[model samples]
Target: VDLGTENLYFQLQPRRVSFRGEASETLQSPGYDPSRPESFFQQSFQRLSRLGHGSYGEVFKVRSKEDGRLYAVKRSMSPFRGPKDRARKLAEVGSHEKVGQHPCCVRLEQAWEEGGILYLQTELCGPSLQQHCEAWGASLPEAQVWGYLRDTLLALAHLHSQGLVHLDVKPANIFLGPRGRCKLGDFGLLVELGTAQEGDPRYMAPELLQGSYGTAADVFSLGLTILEVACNMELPHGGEGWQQLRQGYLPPEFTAGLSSELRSVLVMMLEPDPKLRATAEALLALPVLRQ
Candidate 1:
């Protein structure tokens, strides 16, 4: 996509779920080796059912032939068909696997390319938060909203600390886990910190439309995402162009139903000024969220 200056590509939107441990003092990102072997993949996996398809390829719900474990297997067609474009898609999965493992982040167990196709095995998560909301036909309960917000921030805290920025932070990309827990997945457009890129316009930050940005851009998306999880609908004017975002509205339902603490946090998180927005760490540090 034409994400202003940089060639930032696909992405989505956020939350209040918990993750283990505090932010680390040191951040290390061991980048993936795109040429890694797939011996484990060849011996273990057997495709079971078709999951879905996207711009790049199809995803299948797979089974481990060796142990009967299930996973979401995404296969990119013809790796060498269009080397430049295909490589970016490959990098997307590689970047996700390299982001490191966390309870709140989707696990990328293995990845390898063969016969001009690339395969990625990831943890099989429940339907997305959006799907759950659509099925229920309304906003989730207050406790559930709080839980998602807490967990998402915890994940963001770890991700940001690792110098990664999940440019897209919308409900569709945040998978609903068993017991109502959530896991952030779909790193199709994930980039390192300081890399400004295009995300779903519905959850994008103003600064992103201009140039490269920081983790604060994610907080903007987090605000909008949690707001939707609380309201059961997206904020108006999100799916519009540049001029439209500049004229968006903060829903009254947010203030009418949410408490003072929650409202204040949302406002800060959604600040149009990137400099004024709350960092994931700052959002997690809030006493209200800890409860």
Candidate 2:
């Protein structure tokens, strides 16, 4: 099956109402009272299992009581302090919403706040690329690597066109969905053009260390991630090798098994000078990325 066709993917699935009566009826109960406030999420969805947890918050696989469809929900780790904190927390959702209906970006269905805590409901997806790689216990096949590269670059291009930068681009933030679709998620670090922000040091571009960068930084981070997948090598946080990689130098051992075409693409992406680096849109036009 050709996974590259845009028409084959739907950003959001049709809602399936499984319960009788109006969807609103599911939220109303004999023991419930309008005066007593409750969490909109708790009243509307049933948590099935915990998906993940980190310093940011926790994620869960949930089913809508009204629609009976599965979805993923993210809960903030802490409550808001004031209007400033509330706006700051909601900014992530705002950035995600700006991406609209791109097939390669995770779709945010709804976002709400209750008791100062934020909740984000998004389309359900399979495991992250990091988890998938760990489960495989080996380097990804060349075809699959190419597929993910194309998918991620398309997402980056979409973001770049809007004058936005996905400051954080890594395997853990790239999700695997049904039909072999790869979607970019976790927009917490998303920023406007020329906005400087810190990202995972291991995947950060060299320019970031100097507090100077642009959209090309995303391509640099993605190049390292793709290299890790292709060669099954762990990235260094700091050292001579890390410094070497930032300068567009690929170790002989790492490139030994990669196709020359892919090697060339990586070199262009990892170029230390932002001007010399290949843009996501330009890379998408390359023959090596064509499915």
Candidate 3:
């Protein structure tokens, strides 16, 4: 039996969620480790190339010798003196690995700690939906919006089904993989119902912002995210994108022309109240987005 084969690899979208503390003012430091040239970075695959950098840390596109495959490594730095910080660092690692290998989600391969620095290894995406949309200076067409929204809601639905809530479901946290398939990568803010703090002021539902919410809060966040794609930039205070819902027509003065169904769908999603907001399955419906 001749089995056609391709190298099995993984892709990941990294997020720094738990790190709610500040830098240790005490500098007991080394600029960079001299003895270990690799120092802060343990270049597992050897040919490590930095892909990008964000607020928390840097990412390197790495190659693995064992499987001749590729992966993304995320290394974030925070000074930890004793056990508490170390425990939080390791707890996050455990949380990610526990949720590993979901198709619509980023995959976490391994996580470890050296000294005080924590390292997480996973696959990498080009960038994020937020970055992609910002580059264009315009919103996606309704068709395109529906496609991405549908994929995103699918991932949201799965997370909901698994008893997890992705408190941070913004465009910046989402990754676009091959074929522009949407995947919800960062689960850093993901928390069970009892544990969740009030989310961000903007995308957060009125109820959630008021210290109340459930699965529906996520739906509201999804709506704001959809707006991130539908409009040139997201304006929660009711602007061109907000007009899609507030008024029945697209903002004629605006650049991107959206369809009526999409406008209605977005309007429904933009509902301030979480209780009456549309569901993920409902968002996936509508004649315009049924694909």
Candidate 4:
């Protein structure tokens, strides 16, 4: 048999014949030959290992065959259902493209769609704040927390100035890069102001729960995230305690070890009223944070 013809024959067959028939369309084709490099993804990079997984999809650590550099690729979980879904995915990509140029935001290197799934390539970073906290098994040092706050707030300020809001701001979505740098990642839930969307209830602002919000909503979430890190406090799902925190009430024990300046900043960020909440840009200008 001619080798070229034999290879063509294999490619023509159904990649993976499954009992579910049509459902198999969503599965990665077994016939995909990495050596062949038929798809753009295959031609350019090689997947190494899964870095993380979430509702949006699995993020894989990939290496660029051309540049010999490591990158992270986020692959959507499933094929888009319709144009609306496709547009939303593109919008998510657009959000990242718009704000990623900042040093504090994860830089999107490239994006492409194959087999109806979107793949976003970004600069690889170290573990997330959540993972770091888990390993330390205690509250982070005040200086370290301040460093994270400075980076994240800068990212938020940039996003807000562009009329965008990161609906989901949590320790898990904040990544630690080289030299203790923090970059805000995961733009899946980002949206423009006046757009209402649900976010992680644990970090959601009271105004968001009431069906109205703006950039201030992000400040509230960041407040909770920092509080969680500064004191190793386990955020409640929803209860009296959750409500109280939103109202700018922190248990004495939670602030017992926190510096007065840090505690004051937390209170400003956690203000119950959106109108009273500190803006990201304003917070960034604080002398305490500057030092």
Candidate 5:
């Protein structure tokens, strides 16, 4: 079950998704010949641990018997009851397949279906940014924090350039590897570049709550992620968190001791008006982000 977390305070119109169409054709990954059948069996993997779940399915960290490597497998059994839901799910798969063009984005290794369950295997990295924060004490190291932001924005820039938007860009979806490389993962909610009022409400841009929003929505979520990493705490979830964001409330110590340039970059990212919000390209060009 979904645990009923997908619902929002406002009525959500199903955003138009593209899969198995001209857009999907244009965005197809190289060597993704899904025509031939490939077998993926439960016996081939030993489940190391249960990762988590979403509206459509569950995920697990597993070690492959053949390759002796780790991978995350997301299983969706029900497969959705309607055509629209089916299209959305397929688009999610396409997003993962197409997004691997950038090294900062997780790459999908294999995809197959068996026993009514669809399995998507991806590169297994270290724990999520949220999990890393839980063990990082009160705050992340300044240099390490900058690394995360820099890599994330680089990946986002690539995604935007390719005509996509990561509708969901929260800490839980961002993963950090052992060598300090940060990768954006979890493309289940990905969408093509356009107006789509979708994303986790806690980090959802204010303009998204009102109506159509653009690429700037991802910037707002990045701002929330910066605050979350700086304080080593996640924002509250659900309706109240949505309300807090709608009011433009920042963390109590958001600006304390941070450099003025850093603060300015963040403020521009969190701008309520989408028109004035920072773009990934602009933010990536700022001196504060330069190495």
Candidate 6:
């Protein structure tokens, strides 16, 4: 079970998920055929590898047969997959349409349903910031990290405007593209902020912890991630020692030395209360962010 730590968060990938479709929907047998993604293995993938798995289905790195550009495809299992399952998928794709097209966000190309499995294709990039942090650590300069975080909050603010909440936001989901640009990926748990599923506890706003929340839940997760990055750029799990990470903050060091205006934007954007959380448009207005 989850221990309410970031390190174990990566382990949430599932080996398989079980569920039945609408009241009488038939469960399709697992098989491989290239004609469709349902038999994803048989499909024309330039490079298809197991990236990760979830309760709904498996995620894979797929290369386009047409142009050879690589992409990430999330395939959902068949047999009705529950109302929530399809609802989340709808939210995922809908959110993508709203924000995923940007180079910084995962670019969603297409979505298809075949033989019971629902598939979504989006632009793919290198390993996540979480992976990089684990390997050598986030060596990115404070200025760079600040820029990345600003972009992320800008995106999250946009999602919130659409009444969507990325229930789960962590290092594992933030992809690093070429030239230090950040790419937001993995929208498996996307939904309206009003609907808080207890599983996303870490990113929980206080209200969410008390079993209620809104778009601000994602902002809280953003703050946790930025804090980890600020403290030596390492993605600290439970074993990483919160005290050690917390101690890394040298208030007078003035390392990040962000402008007062920009710094204030971050402070308010990260507020734990939805009532005080900053909106995307308001966040983008900060002057230092452009610098």
lDDT of each: 0.71, 0.81, 0.64, 0.82, 0.71, 0.60
Candidate 2 lDDT for residue 119: 79
User: What's the lDDT for residue 88 in model 2?
Assistant: 68
The segments of candidate 4 whose C-alpha lies over 4 angstroms from its true place after superposition are: 1-38, 194-196
TM-score of 5: 0.78
State model 2's lDDT: 0.81
**Local error of candidate 2 at residue 251 (angstroms):** 2.2
* C-alpha RMSD of each candidate structure in angstroms: 9.6, 10.3, 11.8, 9.7, 8.3, 9.1
Q: Which segments of candidate 2 are over 4 A away from where they belong?
A: 1-38, 194-196
Model 6 lDDT tens row, 4-88: 3435232111111212122432223234334343344334455569787767778788777656778887877554345555455
lDDT of 5 by residue, 1-291 (tens): 242244541201112133334433111222223343433344567789988887668889988776788898888857454445544566667788777657789878666544335567788878899888887867787678788988899988988887787878988989997677799998887777653336777777777756665678788888888777865656776676656654666556544756666667777877877888878999888887876
User: What is candidate 1's lDDT per residue for 102-196, written digit by digit as tens?
Assistant: 88888886665555566677888888888888888987777888888888888888888978888899998898778868988888777886543
**Which residue pairs show collisions in model 4?**
none
After TM-score superposition, the amount by which residue 83's alpha carbon in candidate 3 deviates from its true location, in angstroms, is 4.0
Q: What TM-score fits each model?
A: 0.78, 0.86, 0.73, 0.85, 0.78, 0.68
Write model 2 residue lDDT over 1-291, tens digit each, in one string.
Answer: 333343523301112121122353223323334455656666677899999999878999998775788999999888665655665677787788877789999998777666667778899998999998998898898888888999999999999999888888999999997766699999988888754247888899998888776899899999999999888889998999889988778888767999988888899889999888999989998887876
lDDT (10s digit) by residue, model 3, range 152-175:
888877777666777777888778
> Cα lDDT for residue 46, model 4?
81
Comparing 1 and 6 on lDDT, the stronger one: 1
Per-residue C-alpha lDDT of model 4 across residues 1-291, encoded as one tens digit per residue: 232233323222212222222444332323345446476566567889999998888998988875788999888888766666766776777778767589999988766677677878889988899998999899999989999999999999999998898989999999998887799998878987764347888999899877786899999999999999999999997989988897778888777999999999999999999999999989989888884
Q: List candidate 6 stretches off by more than 4 Å.
A: 1-41, 54-56, 77-91, 98-100, 138-140, 193-199, 232-266
Q: How far is candidate 3 from the true structure (C-alpha RMSD, Å)?
A: 11.8
